[PDB]
Amino acid sequence: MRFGFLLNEVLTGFRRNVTMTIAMILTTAISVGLFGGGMLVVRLADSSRAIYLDRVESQVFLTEDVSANDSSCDTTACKALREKIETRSDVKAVRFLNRQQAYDDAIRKFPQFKDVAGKDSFPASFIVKLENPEQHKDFDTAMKGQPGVLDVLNQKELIDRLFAVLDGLSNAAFAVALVQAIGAILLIANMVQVAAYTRRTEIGIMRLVGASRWYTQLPFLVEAMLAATMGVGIAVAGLMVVRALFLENALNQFYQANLIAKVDYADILFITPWLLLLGVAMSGLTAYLTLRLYV
Amino acid sequence: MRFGFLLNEVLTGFRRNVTMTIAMILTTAISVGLFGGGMLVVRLADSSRAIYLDRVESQVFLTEDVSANDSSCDTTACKALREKIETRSDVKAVRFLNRQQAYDDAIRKFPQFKDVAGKDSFPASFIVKLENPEQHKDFDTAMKGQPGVLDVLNQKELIDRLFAVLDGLSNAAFAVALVQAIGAILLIANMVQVAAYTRRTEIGIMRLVGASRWYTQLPFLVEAMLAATMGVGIAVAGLMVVRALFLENALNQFYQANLIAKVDYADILFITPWLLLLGVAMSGLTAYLTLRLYV
Amino acid sequence: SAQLDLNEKLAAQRAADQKLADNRTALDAARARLATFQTAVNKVAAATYMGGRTHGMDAILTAESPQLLIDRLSVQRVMAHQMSTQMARFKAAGEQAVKAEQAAAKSAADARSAAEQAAAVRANLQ
Amino acid sequence: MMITLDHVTKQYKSSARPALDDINVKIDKGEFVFLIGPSGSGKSTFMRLLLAAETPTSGDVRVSKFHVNKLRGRHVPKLRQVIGCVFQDFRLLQQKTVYDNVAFALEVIGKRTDAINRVVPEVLETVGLSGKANRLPDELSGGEQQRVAIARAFVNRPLVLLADEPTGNLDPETSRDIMDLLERINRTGTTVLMATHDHHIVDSMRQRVVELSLGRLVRDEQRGV
Amino acid sequence: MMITLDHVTKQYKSSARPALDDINVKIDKGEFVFLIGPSGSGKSTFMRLLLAAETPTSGDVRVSKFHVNKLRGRHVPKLRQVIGCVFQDFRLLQQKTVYDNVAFALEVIGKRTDAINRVVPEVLETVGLSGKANRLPDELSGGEQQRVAIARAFVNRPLVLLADEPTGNLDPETSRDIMDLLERINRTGTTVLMATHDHHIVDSMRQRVVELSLGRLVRDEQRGVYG
Ligand SMILES: Nc1ncnc2c1ncn2[C@@H]1O[C@H](COP(=O)(O)OP(=O)(O)O)[C@@H](O)[C@H]1O
Ligand SMILES: Nc1ncnc2c1ncn2[C@@H]1O[C@H](COP(=O)(O)OP(=O)(O)O)[C@@H](O)[C@H]1O
């Protein structure tokens, strides 16, 4: 029935003991915050995959006169340079990117390329993929900075070290979020145990009056739900608190330094309904499984 | 005394509270492991500076009017810098690199830029060898904007904000540990009340039998400190497994780049006598204060 | 009288003609200066191409020796200072194509005005 | 119309008494049935068996409505509304008042609230706890907590109301002061079960007597002392 | 000086009738004085007053071998060794048997191990229900759970061995032996007392019967009966 006569006893229930009832909120906030840290570094990897290049990638440049002109590859020289690149078997996903379709994706990956970009913005590139990271050293030897094919770039072999840092810290964040989730699920598991221990006077009365079996555990469930909302209400604020605490040394300076793609509060805020729904779901299920085998 | 009797009821307390003790003994490990990881990363942060602390240099960069005019040093403005900079406490030897000399140094360091890279690339270098790295504050606050010197911007203290991004997360680990600390003292302080309901059948006889007050709460006191000792014992193994599972590849890739002083089992176990006594102190003092107030 | 009112201004006319003539041989210096400067600012976007990868913050993506990466940042921050001052050095030459180049045209118009004035006054003799 | 059970045993550990090996009791409408004997006969287990919190390993359980031997859990509390009983510590919330403690059951079963608050003084003015019932029961004397205990069984319309452990740590003079309140509620028609442990009561009332001796009928004559 | 209490007063939450007043009553060894006061009034105050658990706001309280009106840091269990009380309920440990339950009060003082095992074949036979010394407290019946509850207070021979309402949920046709074993402790030489609304039964012994109605003593007969 109406929740007005059900809300008036739960506040008294938090009022009787205060030295135990406040501890759970910060622990669930820490668990949710580290899990959201893992989510935000996964989304950071997803955003940084767009600006950077993946682990099957080794691009190549072309000769200056060939790259500075010859937009249509119907001529002899563009096909000759393309076949010179395609002599080896490493060519898999070369793209027809030259000049007019090469300005927009290249002004966003680096900020100082947009400076004085009116004259000689970007020549022909023809970015190509790779299947063998251990066997393209001779390919880079043939396609080195010798006159002809210009200098190349390889986003691996002590170059993708930031990716190897971030996925490892993402997995470490996943592991510590798992052990915080285990601690959280056991502490809100024995929440109802110590609550029924501290409120054992009326339990036999509720078994005596003959009320419905669904309605007996409803105050404990609404205390679990309001405790979950109290946890997530400071969990969504502690991320901003630690950002404004210890992100001002960098903030957006990695955008000009081209380390990360983007950072903004809305990217973290995109994950909040999923984490609060999973939090109230885990709170409800451990309420139900603990009440099933105790009374 | 009768120390042999104390070992048979601790297993009874463990078995009677099997679904209760496990969450707090698991989360005290994470509580001390956050502090241990923070101490490890600040030790790595101020040990990684030692790869350049032995070779701390400095410089004086002079205004382009007396560098683009003359290659070598044949002006009275350059001859004034032979004596007006050498009258300092932190000077070893001055070296006058030309625009050509430092330009060729920059070219052989990295083949970067074509049009602007030349005589007008950057002014000439007056390298000043620093005596002590700890007195860089007096170095960069002793000389200011003066005629003949365009900037007193340093060149060797500048790695410090490059690991300020590591420092920020290093202090953020301490901040996370201190945020979880309030909940940690709460979850160790409510143990004397959430376990008193189980031992209701035995606590009532010491209140009139003649048992000493120093021996009554001692079985209640020993549980918290044994829990804290096994918590730090499983916490150091957790640091071992997160170092050996999720902190090996990036550590090896940066140690091959020799930017770090590297950690091993012995380095992490070096701090451990401090954190074990810190953990047993924050167990024992809180457990000793909560027994008088709770009971 | 009116015949005698000639030689007092041939000196000023020759001075005006020589002031036009040497300024015609002095206006070429600004266009020669921009003809020296504009080649270093036209394909500098191609000079930072070929994977330049150095920008004055990290200098850490490649490493062989700790000593050899010090000048990868200590010179690159001075490069950042120089590309900050490069726009000022470009505009200090671009202002010469905006300021103090119409003075030759103004002097030519003033010389034509003096020529028609001298043609107007000389009707007292002729 | 016949509310009894027979051959109903639980057998926790058997030993001295496997609950109730053989019973042949009978409860009538308005029947006052005594229950005394030794301490180990298994009285409170049989009291829990009538409210069906103890699993009947043998026999079938039914009190005047339906067989509760094999019933689904949603229909388990559908018999417990007409069942009342009292205990030693009274299960009283010290923060609540006397009227709040009895109206808590009325507001937690869930009815029309305008038909709940109006009928609280309609049935609360029967015991001596009416008057100064807005105060906390901690400062009150020892004679009025049993009124609050029987009030929450008095407010509904009972059929299987019961009285187990009726006196406890209470004086014989106050017992004679409370027997009459416990008997006047039986004049409506609802029977009650007398489950004391004293022999000073059997001569005083002279009603139906059932005595158990470790699961066996010690004495059963249903008349007189 | 032996046990004397007077002028006790402990009012809680502005109680109108705290049942502690200026009763200058004197107790003695030998005759055991039984309180017949009203229920729910004052019977629990005697144990907490005599064991210095509920200190009165006024009135100096004296015991035989110590001081009750003033305590210190280490004197708070000093009286508790030579006295003993048994409550109504059993509170036995189901983790140990009956033989180990009576020895649980031996190690809490700091007794040496030479006399720990040297007294358990000396006091267990003094109890009427000596038992099999291997009985579970849960398995045993409700008749014998209180005699083993008072046996553990007997093992040190305390000077005070009172017990409030020793029957509990026990029939009086079986509780007579439990009542009749108390005079063994009484002619041991100690002081015993019990406060129970048990009229028409204790008048057979015709012992000292007192009553405290509202903090007022209405009877002080040395060998009287129930009023
Ligand atoms: N869960 C149980 N496990 C073992 N024995 C039990 C259990 N419940 C009841 N008993 C036994 O049944 C008997 C019930 O006695 P009971 O008539 O309830 O005593 P009283 O009337 O004084 O409460 C007890 O002696 C006890 O030993
Ligand atoms: N410090 C105190 N705080 C609250 N209540 C007290 C205190 N001291 C005594 N009382 C009350 O005094 C009453 C004494 O009644 P008593 O006859 O001892 O009850 P019982 O017959 O149940 O033992 C108790 O009900 C108790 O609530």
Domains of chain C, by residue range, sit at 7-124
What DSSP element (H or E) covers E122? helix E120-123
CA distance to partner chain A, nearest, from residue B83 (Å): 38
> Which residues of chain E are within 8 Å of residue B212 when distances are taken between CB atoms?
77, 109-110
Whether E141 sits inside 8 A of D169 (CB atoms) is no
Total domain count, chain B = 2
Q: How far is A238 from chain B (nearest CA, A)?
A: 10
Task: Give the relative orientation of helices C76-94 and C28-37 as an angle to the nearest 10 degrees.
Answer: 150
CATH number at D1-84+158-225: 3.40.50.300
B98 by Cβ neighbours in 10 Å (0-12 / 13-18 / 19+) ranks as middle
Based on the domain organization, do B8 and B146 belong to the same domain? no
Q: Is A293 on the interface with B (CB under 8 A)?
A: no
Domain with CATH 3.40.50.300 in chain D: 1-84+158-225
State yes or no: chains C and A have 3 or more CB pairs below 8 A.
Answer: yes
**Chain B, chain E: beta-carbon pairs less than 8 Å apart:** 56
Residue A154 lies in a domain: no
Put simply, whether A266 touches B (Cβ < 8 Å) is: no
- Nearest in space to E167 (alpha carbons), one of E50, E87, E51, E47: E87
CA dist., res. D162 & res. D84, Å (int): 5
Which residues lie closer than 8 Å to A5 by C-beta, 6 or more apart? D107, D113
Instruction: Confirm if E153 and E84 have CB atoms less than 8 A apart.
Output: yes
In a domain, B157, yes or no: no
Q: At what angle do helices B265-294 and B21-47 cross, to 10 degrees?
A: 140
Q: Are residues A48 and A193 in the same domain?
A: yes
D36 DSSP β-pair partners:
D211
Are both A257 and A198 inside the same structural domain?
Answer: yes
Q: Which domain holds residue B66?
A: 54-151
Give the closest of E139, E165, E172 to D15, CB-based: E139
The finding on whether E40 has its CB within 6 A of some atom of ligand 2 is: yes
Q: Degrees (nearest 5) of the Cα angle D191, D192, D197?
A: 155
Are C39 and B112 a contacting pair at CB < 8 A? no
Q: Could you tell me the distance, in angstroms and rounded to a whole number, from the CA of residue A180 to the centre of ligand 1?
A: 44
Look up residue C18 and give its two tokens.
């020589």
Please indicate, yes or no, whether residues A99 and A123 belong to a single structural domain of this protein. Answer: yes
Residue A48 and residue A68 in one domain? no
| E strand intervals along chain B | 60-62, 91-97, 125-130, 149-151
Question: Tokens representing A151?
Answer: 């200098």
Cβ(E50)–Cβ(E210) below 8 Å: no
- Resolution of this entry in Å? 5.7
Atom 14 (ligand 1) nearest CA: D42
Extended beta strands in chain E, E state: 4-5, 33-35, 61-62, 83-86, 160-163, 208-212, 217-221
A139, with CB counted inside 10 A (0-12, 13-18, 19+), is buried
- Residue to substitute in D14, D17, D43 for testing ligand 1 pocket (most ligand atoms within 8 angstroms of CB): D43
Would you call E170 an interface residue with chain D, using a CB distance cutoff of 8 Å? yes
Cβ-based contacts of D79 with chain A (< 8 Å): 210
Give the determination technique.
cryo-EM
Q: Are residues B202 and B269 in the same domain?
A: yes
Is B22 contained in some domain? Answer: yes
Question: Do both B131 and B234 map to the same domain?
Answer: no
The answer to whether the Cβ–Cβ distance between E141 and D16 falls below 8 Å is yes
Quick one: which H or E segment has residue D35?
strand D32-36
Ligand number nearest CA of D165 is 1
Residues B104 and B235 reside in one and the same domain: no
**CB of E14 sitting under 6 A from ligand 2:** no
CATH for E1-91+159-227 is 3.40.50.300
Beta carbons within 8 Å of B162's beta carbon, 6+ residues apart: C57, C58, C60
Name the H helices within C1-126. Answer: 7-24, 28-37, 39-42, 44-47, 71-74, 76-94, 103-121
Among E140, E164, E169, the residue to mutate for chain D (most D Cβ within 10 A): E169
User: Is residue B54 packed enough to be buried (19+ CB in 10 Å), middle (13-18) or exposed (0-12)?
Assistant: exposed
- Is residue A258 situated within a structural domain? yes
Q: What is the CATH number of the domain that holds A125?
A: 3.30.70.3040
Of B161, B187, B250, the CB nearest to A168: B250
How far apart CA A12 and CA A17 sit, in angstroms, is: 9
Contacts 24+ apart (CB under 8 A), E222-227: E222/E31, E223/E31, E226/E36, E226/E199, E226/E200, E226/E202, E227/E36
Kindly list the residues from chain C whose CB atom is less than 8 angstroms away from the CB atom of residue A164: none
Amino acid at D78: K
Q: Are residues B124 and B260 in the same domain?
A: no
Last residue of a domain, one of B151, B185, B203: B151
Ligand 2 lined by E39 (C-beta under 6 Å): yes
Q: Among partner residues D91, D95, D107, which is closest to A5 by beta-carbon distance?
A: D107
Instruction: For chain D, count helices (H), then strands (E).
Output: 7, 5
In a shared domain, residues B173 and B40: yes
Both structure tokens of D131: 């008057």
Q: Is there a single domain that holds both residue B189 and residue B216? A: yes
B285 lies in the same domain as B210: yes
CA distance A13 to chain D (A): 11
The domain boundary residue, chosen from A142, A170, A197: A142
Q: For ligand 2, atom 19, name the residue with the nearest CA.
A: E40
Domain C-terminal end among B116, B132, B151: B151
